PDB file of C-alpha atoms and ligand atoms in Angstrom:
ATOM      1  CA  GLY A   1      72.260 120.522  68.755  1.00 56.59           C
ATOM      2  CA  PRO A   2      74.421 118.079  66.896  1.00 59.80           C
ATOM      3  CA  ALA A   3      77.322 118.359  69.387  1.00 60.61           C
ATOM      4  CA  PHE A   4      74.856 117.539  72.079  1.00 60.59           C
ATOM      5  CA  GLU A   5      73.555 114.455  70.446  1.00 58.55           C
ATOM      6  CA  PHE A   6      77.154 113.299  69.828  1.00 61.75           C
ATOM      7  CA  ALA A   7      78.047 113.773  73.452  1.00 59.46           C
ATOM      8  CA  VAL A   8      75.145 111.749  74.867  1.00 58.57           C
ATOM      9  CA  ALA A   9      76.058 108.860  72.562  1.00 54.16           C
ATOM     10  CA  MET A  10      79.752 109.112  73.493  1.00 52.99           C
ATOM     11  CA  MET A  11      79.202 109.237  77.257  1.00 51.60           C
ATOM     12  CA  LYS A  12      76.786 106.285  77.313  1.00 52.47           C
ATOM     13  CA  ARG A  13      79.412 104.134  75.462  1.00 55.06           C
ATOM     14  CA  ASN A  14      82.811 105.094  76.891  1.00 52.72           C
ATOM     15  CA  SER A  15      82.373 107.140  80.163  1.00 50.80           C
ATOM     16  CA  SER A  16      81.995 106.054  83.729  1.00 47.77           C
ATOM     17  CA  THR A  17      81.932 107.631  87.203  1.00 49.71           C
ATOM     18  CA  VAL A  18      85.107 107.131  89.088  1.00 47.85           C
ATOM     19  CA  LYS A  19      85.922 107.808  92.819  1.00 49.25           C
ATOM     20  CA  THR A  20      89.495 108.300  93.982  1.00 46.84           C
ATOM     21  CA  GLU A  21      90.603 109.135  97.496  1.00 47.18           C
ATOM     22  CA  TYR A  22      90.780 112.614  96.254  1.00 45.95           C
ATOM     23  CA  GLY A  23      87.130 112.935  94.927  1.00 43.58           C
ATOM     24  CA  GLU A  24      84.532 111.791  92.306  1.00 45.72           C
ATOM     25  CA  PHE A  25      85.320 112.348  88.662  1.00 43.39           C
ATOM     26  CA  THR A  26      84.070 111.633  85.186  1.00 41.13           C
ATOM     27  CA  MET A  27      86.340 109.123  83.483  1.00 38.50           C
ATOM     28  CA  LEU A  28      86.711 108.569  79.663  1.00 36.93           C
ATOM     29  CA  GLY A  29      87.899 105.191  78.379  1.00 34.59           C
ATOM     30  CA  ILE A  30      90.036 105.534  75.233  1.00 35.35           C
ATOM     31  CA  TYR A  31      91.098 102.076  74.092  1.00 32.87           C
ATOM     32  CA  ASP A  32      92.047  98.676  75.443  1.00 34.18           C
ATOM     33  CA  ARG A  33      92.122  99.297  79.217  1.00 36.83           C
ATOM     34  CA  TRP A  34      93.469 102.888  79.052  1.00 37.41           C
ATOM     35  CA  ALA A  35      91.382 105.678  80.402  1.00 38.45           C
ATOM     36  CA  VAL A  36      92.120 109.352  81.248  1.00 37.92           C
ATOM     37  CA  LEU A  37      91.541 111.290  84.455  1.00 37.97           C
ATOM     38  CA  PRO A  38      92.534 114.821  85.418  1.00 40.47           C
ATOM     39  CA  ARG A  39      95.923 114.744  87.042  1.00 42.51           C
ATOM     40  CA  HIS A  40      94.568 116.082  90.294  1.00 43.44           C
ATOM     41  CA  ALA A  41      92.291 112.989  90.629  1.00 45.05           C
ATOM     42  CA  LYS A  42      95.505 111.310  91.833  1.00 43.12           C
ATOM     43  CA  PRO A  43      94.369 107.604  91.523  1.00 42.71           C
ATOM     44  CA  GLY A  44      95.873 105.114  93.843  1.00 40.29           C
ATOM     45  CA  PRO A  45      96.492 101.406  93.311  1.00 39.95           C
ATOM     46  CA  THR A  46      92.647 100.825  93.280  1.00 40.18           C
ATOM     47  CA  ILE A  47      89.856 103.108  92.151  1.00 41.25           C
ATOM     48  CA  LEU A  48      85.974 103.012  92.466  1.00 37.36           C
ATOM     49  CA  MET A  49      84.513 102.808  89.097  1.00 37.27           C
ATOM     50  CA  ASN A  50      80.742 102.589  88.635  1.00 39.81           C
ATOM     51  CA  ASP A  51      80.807 101.854  92.474  1.00 40.69           C
ATOM     52  CA  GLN A  52      83.072  98.757  92.201  1.00 45.06           C
ATOM     53  CA  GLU A  53      86.753  98.473  93.087  1.00 46.09           C
ATOM     54  CA  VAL A  54      89.082  98.305  90.187  1.00 44.35           C
ATOM     55  CA  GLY A  55      92.888  97.831  90.376  1.00 38.02           C
ATOM     56  CA  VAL A  56      95.198 100.284  88.512  1.00 37.86           C
ATOM     57  CA  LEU A  57      97.988  98.513  86.547  1.00 37.91           C
ATOM     58  CA  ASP A  58      99.741 101.770  85.557  1.00 39.58           C
ATOM     59  CA  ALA A  59      99.396 105.585  85.903  1.00 39.31           C
ATOM     60  CA  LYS A  60     101.200 107.985  83.562  1.00 41.98           C
ATOM     61  CA  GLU A  61     101.139 111.668  84.726  1.00 41.74           C
ATOM     62  CA  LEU A  62     101.465 113.361  81.328  1.00 42.58           C
ATOM     63  CA  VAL A  63     104.186 115.980  80.841  1.00 45.54           C
ATOM     64  CA  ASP A  64     105.574 117.629  77.777  1.00 44.40           C
ATOM     65  CA  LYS A  65     109.220 117.407  76.379  1.00 43.94           C
ATOM     66  CA  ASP A  66     110.418 120.052  78.890  1.00 40.54           C
ATOM     67  CA  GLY A  67     108.515 118.592  81.898  1.00 40.87           C
ATOM     68  CA  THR A  68     105.631 121.024  81.935  1.00 43.02           C
ATOM     69  CA  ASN A  69     102.483 119.800  83.517  1.00 40.13           C
ATOM     70  CA  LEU A  70      99.546 118.811  81.148  1.00 41.53           C
ATOM     71  CA  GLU A  71      97.062 118.053  84.044  1.00 44.32           C
ATOM     72  CA  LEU A  72      96.278 114.593  82.612  1.00 46.64           C
ATOM     73  CA  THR A  73      96.779 111.087  84.077  1.00 47.18           C
ATOM     74  CA  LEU A  74      96.550 108.021  81.958  1.00 46.26           C
ATOM     75  CA  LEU A  75      95.718 104.754  83.779  1.00 50.56           C
ATOM     76  CA  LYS A  76      95.559 101.151  82.638  1.00 50.80           C
ATOM     77  CA  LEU A  77      92.813  99.258  84.494  1.00 51.63           C
ATOM     78  CA  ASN A  78      92.967  95.708  85.775  1.00 49.60           C
ATOM     79  CA  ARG A  79      89.751  94.606  84.010  1.00 54.08           C
ATOM     80  CA  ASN A  80      88.657  92.373  81.306  1.00 52.27           C
ATOM     81  CA  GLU A  81      86.246  94.531  79.463  1.00 53.57           C
ATOM     82  CA  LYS A  82      87.948  96.608  76.704  1.00 57.81           C
ATOM     83  CA  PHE A  83      87.020 100.153  75.945  1.00 56.11           C
ATOM     84  CA  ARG A  84      85.615 101.066  72.557  1.00 56.13           C
ATOM     85  CA  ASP A  85      88.463 102.545  70.600  1.00 54.63           C
ATOM     86  CA  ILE A  86      87.791 106.222  70.288  1.00 55.82           C
ATOM     87  CA  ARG A  87      91.405 107.343  69.414  1.00 57.41           C
ATOM     88  CA  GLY A  88      90.091 108.232  65.906  1.00 54.83           C
ATOM     89  CA  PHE A  89      88.013 110.954  67.712  1.00 53.63           C
ATOM     90  CA  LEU A  90      91.216 112.344  69.255  1.00 54.28           C
ATOM     91  CA  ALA A  91      92.991 115.065  67.265  1.00 56.91           C
ATOM     92  CA  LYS A  92      96.716 115.320  66.559  1.00 58.99           C
ATOM     93  CA  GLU A  93      96.737 118.933  67.885  1.00 62.70           C
ATOM     94  CA  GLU A  94      94.652 121.282  69.935  1.00 61.68           C
ATOM     95  CA  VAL A  95      91.243 121.567  68.461  1.00 64.52           C
ATOM     96  CA  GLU A  96      89.231 124.809  68.165  1.00 68.16           C
ATOM     97  CA  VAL A  97      85.452 124.705  67.433  1.00 69.62           C
ATOM     98  CA  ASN A  98      82.535 127.225  67.398  1.00 69.92           C
ATOM     99  CA  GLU A  99      80.010 124.986  69.266  1.00 71.28           C
ATOM    100  CA  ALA A 100      81.105 122.473  71.791  1.00 74.57           C
ATOM    101  CA  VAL A 101      79.431 120.747  74.892  1.00 75.29           C
ATOM    102  CA  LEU A 102      81.010 119.658  78.148  1.00 72.42           C
ATOM    103  CA  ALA A 103      79.496 116.376  79.409  1.00 70.36           C
ATOM    104  CA  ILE A 104      79.700 115.254  82.995  1.00 69.98           C
ATOM    105  CA  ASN A 105      78.676 111.936  84.770  1.00 72.89           C
ATOM    106  CA  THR A 106      79.141 111.882  88.598  1.00 72.61           C
ATOM    107  CA  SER A 107      76.740 111.511  91.503  1.00 72.47           C
ATOM    108  CA  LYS A 108      76.615 115.355  91.758  1.00 74.29           C
ATOM    109  CA  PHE A 109      76.130 115.934  88.100  1.00 75.89           C
ATOM    110  CA  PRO A 110      74.664 112.695  86.514  1.00 77.27           C
ATOM    111  CA  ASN A 111      74.698 112.825  82.709  1.00 77.94           C
ATOM    112  CA  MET A 112      74.767 116.609  82.811  1.00 79.16           C
ATOM    113  CA  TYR A 113      75.552 118.574  79.573  1.00 78.37           C
ATOM    114  CA  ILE A 114      76.786 122.029  79.011  1.00 78.46           C
ATOM    115  CA  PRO A 115      76.718 124.648  76.278  1.00 78.55           C
ATOM    116  CA  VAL A 116      80.322 125.974  76.482  1.00 78.79           C
ATOM    117  CA  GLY A 117      80.013 127.573  73.081  1.00 79.01           C
ATOM    118  CA  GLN A 118      83.274 128.601  71.334  1.00 75.06           C
ATOM    119  CA  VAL A 119      86.442 126.677  72.389  1.00 74.56           C
ATOM    120  CA  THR A 120      89.857 128.195  71.526  1.00 78.22           C
ATOM    121  CA  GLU A 121      93.439 127.008  72.126  1.00 75.91           C
ATOM    122  CA  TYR A 122      94.611 128.916  75.193  1.00 77.98           C
ATOM    123  CA  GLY A 123      98.054 127.298  75.704  1.00 78.58           C
ATOM    124  CA  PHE A 124     100.015 128.091  78.903  1.00 79.36           C
ATOM    125  CA  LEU A 125      98.141 128.701  82.028  1.00 79.82           C
ATOM    126  CA  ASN A 126      99.113 128.903  85.690  1.00 82.27           C
ATOM    127  CA  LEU A 127      96.573 126.411  86.963  1.00 84.59           C
ATOM    128  CA  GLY A 128      96.384 126.157  90.769  1.00 85.57           C
ATOM    129  CA  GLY A 129      99.933 127.323  91.212  1.00 86.16           C
ATOM    130  CA  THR A 130     101.154 124.794  88.513  1.00 85.38           C
ATOM    131  CA  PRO A 131     102.409 125.873  85.178  1.00 83.32           C
ATOM    132  CA  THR A 132     100.393 123.873  82.695  1.00 82.98           C
ATOM    133  CA  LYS A 133     100.266 123.828  78.877  1.00 86.58           C
ATOM    134  CA  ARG A 134      97.976 122.698  75.992  1.00 83.46           C
ATOM    135  CA  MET A 135      94.905 124.175  77.641  1.00 81.47           C
ATOM    136  CA  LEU A 136      91.712 124.733  75.787  1.00 80.89           C
ATOM    137  CA  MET A 137      89.396 127.497  76.961  1.00 81.95           C
ATOM    138  CA  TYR A 138      85.675 128.169  76.928  1.00 82.50           C
ATOM    139  CA  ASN A 139      83.508 130.893  78.359  1.00 84.28           C
ATOM    140  CA  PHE A 140      81.129 129.229  80.700  1.00 88.47           C
ATOM    141  CA  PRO A 141      81.011 129.544  84.484  1.00 87.05           C
ATOM    142  CA  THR A 142      82.237 126.114  85.239  1.00 88.72           C
ATOM    143  CA  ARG A 143      81.991 124.586  88.754  1.00 87.62           C
ATOM    144  CA  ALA A 144      83.785 122.301  91.134  1.00 84.51           C
ATOM    145  CA  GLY A 145      82.917 118.703  90.830  1.00 83.19           C
ATOM    146  CA  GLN A 146      83.050 118.977  86.967  1.00 82.92           C
ATOM    147  CA  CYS A 147      86.738 118.029  86.396  1.00 84.02           C
ATOM    148  CA  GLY A 148      86.971 114.886  84.200  1.00 86.51           C
ATOM    149  CA  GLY A 149      84.134 116.160  82.103  1.00 83.91           C
ATOM    150  CA  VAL A 150      84.699 115.444  78.382  1.00 84.27           C
ATOM    151  CA  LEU A 151      84.746 118.405  76.037  1.00 83.17           C
ATOM    152  CA  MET A 152      83.229 117.537  72.610  1.00 86.10           C
ATOM    153  CA  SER A 153      81.793 119.039  69.417  1.00 85.38           C
ATOM    154  CA  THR A 154      80.013 116.942  66.726  1.00 88.00           C
ATOM    155  CA  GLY A 155      82.392 114.014  65.872  1.00 86.82           C
ATOM    156  CA  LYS A 156      85.276 115.200  68.069  1.00 87.58           C
ATOM    157  CA  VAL A 157      86.633 114.726  71.609  1.00 86.19           C
ATOM    158  CA  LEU A 158      88.514 117.935  72.336  1.00 87.59           C
ATOM    159  CA  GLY A 159      89.893 117.272  75.943  1.00 87.83           C
ATOM    160  CA  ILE A 160      89.225 116.872  79.661  1.00 84.50           C
ATOM    161  CA  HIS A 161      87.951 119.620  81.864  1.00 84.26           C
ATOM    162  CA  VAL A 162      90.522 120.401  84.551  1.00 83.89           C
ATOM    163  CA  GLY A 163      89.771 123.934  85.991  1.00 81.58           C
ATOM    164  CA  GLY A 164      88.150 127.234  85.891  1.00 76.64           C
ATOM    165  CA  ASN A 165      87.865 130.640  87.608  1.00 76.42           C
ATOM    166  CA  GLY A 166      84.465 132.165  88.175  1.00 76.06           C
ATOM    167  CA  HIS A 167      83.351 132.581  84.438  1.00 74.72           C
ATOM    168  CA  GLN A 168      85.917 130.531  82.424  1.00 75.24           C
ATOM    169  CA  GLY A 169      86.468 126.822  81.743  1.00 75.48           C
ATOM    170  CA  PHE A 170      89.818 125.165  80.824  1.00 77.30           C
ATOM    171  CA  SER A 171      90.339 121.633  79.280  1.00 76.73           C
ATOM    172  CA  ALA A 172      93.512 119.714  78.754  1.00 77.65           C
ATOM    173  CA  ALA A 173      93.772 118.839  75.096  1.00 75.36           C
ATOM    174  CA  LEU A 174      93.298 115.054  74.619  1.00 79.70           C
ATOM    175  CA  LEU A 175      95.736 114.417  71.835  1.00 80.49           C
ATOM    176  CA  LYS A 176      96.115 111.253  69.667  1.00 79.62           C
ATOM    177  CA  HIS A 177      99.801 110.685  70.292  1.00 78.99           C
ATOM    178  CA  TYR A 178      99.253 110.316  74.021  1.00 78.38           C
ATOM    179  CA  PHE A 179      97.866 106.761  73.369  1.00 74.70           C
ATOM    180  CA  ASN A 180     100.570 105.493  70.809  1.00 72.80           C
TER     181      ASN A 180
HETATM  182  C1  VQR B   1      87.845 120.609  89.230  1.00 73.54           C
HETATM  183  C2  VQR B   1      86.820 120.224  90.479  1.00 73.54           C
HETATM  184  C3  VQR B   1      86.471 118.773  90.685  1.00 73.54           C
HETATM  185  O1  VQR B   1      85.977 118.027  89.902  1.00 73.54           O
HETATM  186  O2  VQR B   1      86.946 118.334  91.897  1.00 73.54           O
HETATM  187  C4  VQR B   1      86.364 117.068  92.275  1.00 73.54           C
HETATM  188  C5  VQR B   1      87.571 121.978  88.698  1.00 73.54           C
HETATM  189  C6  VQR B   1      86.828 123.160  88.927  1.00 73.54           C
HETATM  190  C7  VQR B   1      86.960 124.199  88.753  1.00 73.54           C
HETATM  191  C8  VQR B   1      86.905 125.208  89.927  1.00 73.54           C
HETATM  192  C9  VQR B   1      85.631 126.035  89.518  1.00 73.54           C
HETATM  193  N1  VQR B   1      85.437 125.754  88.075  1.00 73.54           N
HETATM  194  C10 VQR B   1      85.788 124.576  87.665  1.00 73.54           C
HETATM  195  O3  VQR B   1      85.425 124.007  86.787  1.00 73.54           O
HETATM  196  N2  VQR B   1      89.239 122.379  88.775  1.00 73.54           N
HETATM  197  C11 VQR B   1      89.837 122.837  89.851  1.00 73.54           C
HETATM  198  O4  VQR B   1      89.387 122.908  90.959  1.00 73.54           O
HETATM  199  C12 VQR B   1      91.329 123.133  89.580  1.00 73.54           C
HETATM  200  C13 VQR B   1      92.297 122.149  90.305  1.00 73.54           C
HETATM  201  C14 VQR B   1      93.683 122.123  89.904  1.00 73.54           C
HETATM  202  C15 VQR B   1      94.568 121.261  90.812  1.00 73.54           C
HETATM  203  C16 VQR B   1      93.784 121.634  88.414  1.00 73.54           C
HETATM  204  N3  VQR B   1      91.634 124.487  90.027  1.00 73.54           N
HETATM  205  C17 VQR B   1      91.146 125.561  89.390  1.00 73.54           C
HETATM  206  O5  VQR B   1      90.296 125.601  88.498  1.00 73.54           O
HETATM  207  O6  VQR B   1      91.673 126.666  90.001  1.00 73.54           O
HETATM  208  C18 VQR B   1      91.076 128.046  89.535  1.00 73.54           C
HETATM  209  C19 VQR B   1      91.897 128.669  88.558  1.00 73.54           C
HETATM  210  C20 VQR B   1      92.998 129.488  88.973  1.00 73.54           C
HETATM  211  C21 VQR B   1      93.769 130.014  87.912  1.00 73.54           C
HETATM  212  C22 VQR B   1      93.490 129.807  86.594  1.00 73.54           C
HETATM  213  C23 VQR B   1      92.459 129.132  86.236  1.00 73.54           C
HETATM  214  C24 VQR B   1      91.595 128.507  87.157  1.00 73.54           C
END
């Protein structure tokens, strides 16, 4: 319940629907002009954001100290409107909760919310043939078209959905030090 009400408030304020040449994604703005997409969104020099073309000033494919994939891409957008600073909702390490929701905002899933239930720190995962770390896991049959969805519990933004088998979901932890 409370995690659901928090998600709807957060997605109305900070989320948008983004199209790259590789698909449609939920995008979460973090602070200033910095937002986060799953790495496989592979944004080019311009993206489509709320159906309007937006130039990309920089894109950082996040990787740990040994070069291990984190399945996160940080982009600075060439636009004047600043994002509401939600870095205080970002934890310093991988968050576990008992009740979380996954929130999605694309043409295929418009403002759709999801009772993932328990979220635990998974860690390493061979994700699509790519060794990846800092994964968060939930037991929900997550679908395609859902990557970029924002994993949240009440008062917390846990990470970004990046993959899943048939009956499991996996999020890349959205950590505070990623954005200074
Ligand atoms: C991203 C789909 C999307 O939004 O594309 C526009 C999701 C969906 C998955 C697949 C079904 N359940 C989901 O939620 N992620 C993927 O498709 C990823 C892509 C990688 C490049 C990150 N692949 C994936 O989930 O592979 C399945 C898997 C294999 C091994 C271990 C875990 C999952």
